[PDB]
């Protein structure tokens, strides 16, 4: 029908910003025709969008003002959008505005009575989109107009967690001030502290510790200290060790994991730190000859050269200068501390294999890749 093409014209006008031609196309219509043309879900570029939500997405605030003031377009009409590569089903205009960072459109929608806590199919509130993008102005304006900071999403991810993972320190501080629970756990038991420790954002860790966050072990069996050690975040490891009264086994575990992770991380490769942390943990294992904290080593792994992990300071000093042995020791310690739990520990193995292949030592590369594949099954 020609009304469908006219709805296409209206959608193009709203999606580009032309307020005058939009009012021209919407002029002297009937409320029936108004509702039809403004509720017609289109489909341009893998996005199913009604004129209001495409306008709010593209940040054309005067268009949204026309729609909200001269007409009364339904404020909770939903569609499907695309942010970079992600597809988002069940999004409202306010959510798209809060995500794309159009503070003017956010205010226009909130003032005219939009559901501030409307959720996505992934159960994402617009407050969570704002915390993702880091727009503290939008976060503040939403919270002021009674947006619920507690609403988690599909996988029980809060606004605090996504704010801590992305690094928006000021938004994290604001949320913590607004009585946001720092000990909120995700579906797997991970807190915002785990996410902040992985990314290395140390200021977020400082703020979370200031608000008395708790070091909980997630379902993967990892303290935030273990998360920081595994990710070669030495600053976070030192901070968490200083604040928490970690027992000697946890501290030695963290030191050994941090040292081992420095041996096969492409970004943080540092053999001297590897040996330093491994040797420090060994020394503290042998601090008291009458109370030696022995290490329950795993059986020899053929791909790692059938080598057994060093069990005393002499065995570790023996490989102080053997760079290859230190690589293999890092892999062994990573597998001993993490392999039991449900963790994909295969990536540094593949990296060490790739380096050995770059140096044309094909046999060891193939051994390492075979072991990684055997671990995956």
């Amino acid at each position: 029908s020609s009304m469908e093409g006219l709805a296409g014209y209206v959608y193009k006008a709203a999606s580009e910003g032309k307020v005058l031609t939009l009012a021209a196309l919407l002029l002297n219509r009937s409320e029936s025709d108004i509702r039809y043309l403004l509720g017609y879900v289109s489909q341009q570029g893998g996005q199913r969008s009604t004129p209001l939500i495409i306008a709010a997405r593209n940040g054309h605030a005067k268009v949204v003002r026309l729609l909200l003031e001269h007409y009364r377009v339904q404020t909770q009409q939903t569609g499907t959008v695309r942010f970079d590569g992600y597809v988002i089903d069940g999004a409202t205009a306010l959510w798209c505005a809060a995500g794309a960072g159009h503070f003017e459109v956010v205010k226009l929608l909130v003032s005219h009575g939009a559901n501030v806590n409307h959720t996505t199919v992934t159960n994402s509130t617009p407050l969570r989109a704002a915390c993702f993008d880091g727009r503290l102005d939008i976060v503040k304006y939403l919270v002021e107009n009674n947006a619920n900071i507690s609403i988690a999403n599909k996988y029980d991810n809060t606004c605090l967690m996504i704010a801590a993972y992305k690094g928006h320190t000021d938004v994290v501080r604001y949320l913590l001030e607004q009585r946001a629970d720092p000990n909120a756990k995700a579906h797997c038991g991970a807190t915002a502290l785990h996410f902040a420790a992985e990314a290395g954002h140390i200021d977020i860790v400082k703020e979370l510790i200031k608000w008395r966050a708790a070091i909980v072990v997630n379902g993967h069996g990892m303290t935030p200290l273990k998360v920081a050690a595994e990710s070669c975040k030495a600053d976070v490891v030192e901070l968490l060790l200083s604040h928490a009264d970690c027992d000697r086994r946890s501290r030695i575990e963290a030191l050994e994991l941090l040292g081992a992770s420095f041996a096969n991380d492409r970004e943080n490769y540092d053999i001297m730190k590897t040996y330093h942390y491994l040797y420090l943990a060994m020394l503290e294992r042998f601090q008291d000859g009458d109370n030696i904290l022995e290490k329950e080593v795993l059986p020899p792994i053929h791909a790692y050269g059938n080598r057994t992990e060093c069990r005393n300071p002499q065995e570790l000093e023996a490989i102080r200068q053997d760079r290859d042995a230190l690589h293999m020791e890092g892999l062994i310690v990573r597998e001993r501390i993490l392999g039991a739990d449900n963790i994909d520990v295969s990536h540094p193995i593949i990296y060490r294999g790739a380096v050995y292949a770059d140096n044309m030592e094909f046999e060891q590369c193939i051994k390492l890749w075979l072991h990684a594949l055997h671990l995956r099954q």
Binding site: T122, N153, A190, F195, N218, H220, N342, I343, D344
Partner: peptide, 17 residues
């Protein structure tokens, strides 16, 4: 190339969401 709905490195979600 991780899921945006869960910021846990140790999960195993099907990318996408």
């Amino acid at each position: 190339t991780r899921t945006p709905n869960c910021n846990c490195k140790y999960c195993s979600h099907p990318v996408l969401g």
